[PDB]
Amino acid sequence: GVFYYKTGDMQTDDTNHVRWFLNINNENAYVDSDIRIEDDIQSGQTLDIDSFDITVNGSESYRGQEGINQLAQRYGATISADSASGHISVYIPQGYASLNSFSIMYLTKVDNPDQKTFENNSKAWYKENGKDAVDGKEFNHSVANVNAGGV
């Protein structure tokens, strides 16, 4: 389960946002297919479309809406987001997915400050070289609201 996962966190210095990370091809594997991630941000928070920050191979950073356009040019990797619905689609073509790790960070704005946890759900489609295809397996994550303690 290393190929793809999502995580997130809320920092004490920014309790009005949740930071989410879609971490794709984390072991820099060869891929036998395109990669598709379908992400649905759960209620109580709103995607900040300007907050996207994509790191490739832990070094190259692509920031904001222009960064998304540059990432599309360099890696054919498209990020489509709809703040209204909380839906994010990521597509990375096979040729650019291979050997490259992608960490897609975005922020959501907390809409319900008293809400106990913030959730982000995703599903992934990919085929790593020498491994069975993963066909829409779920990768979800919950972040505890640091405003609403010790867990």
Q: How crowded is residue 123: how many other Cβ atoms within 10 Å of its Cβ?
A: 17
Dihedral angle sign, alpha carbons of residues 150, 42, 35, 78: negative
Contact 46, 86 (CB under 8 A): yes
CA pair distance 122, 39, nearest whole angstrom: 4
Residue with the two structure tokens 């946002």: 17
The tokens for 62 are: 């692509």
| Three-state secondary structure call for residue 12 | coil
Residue with the two structure tokens 């992608």: 102
**Experimental method used, please?**
X-ray
CA pair distance 38, 91, nearest whole angstrom: 9
Alpha-carbon separation of residue 30 from 9, 61, 68, 96, 123 (angstroms): 29, 21, 23, 10, 20
State the resolution, in angstroms: 1.6
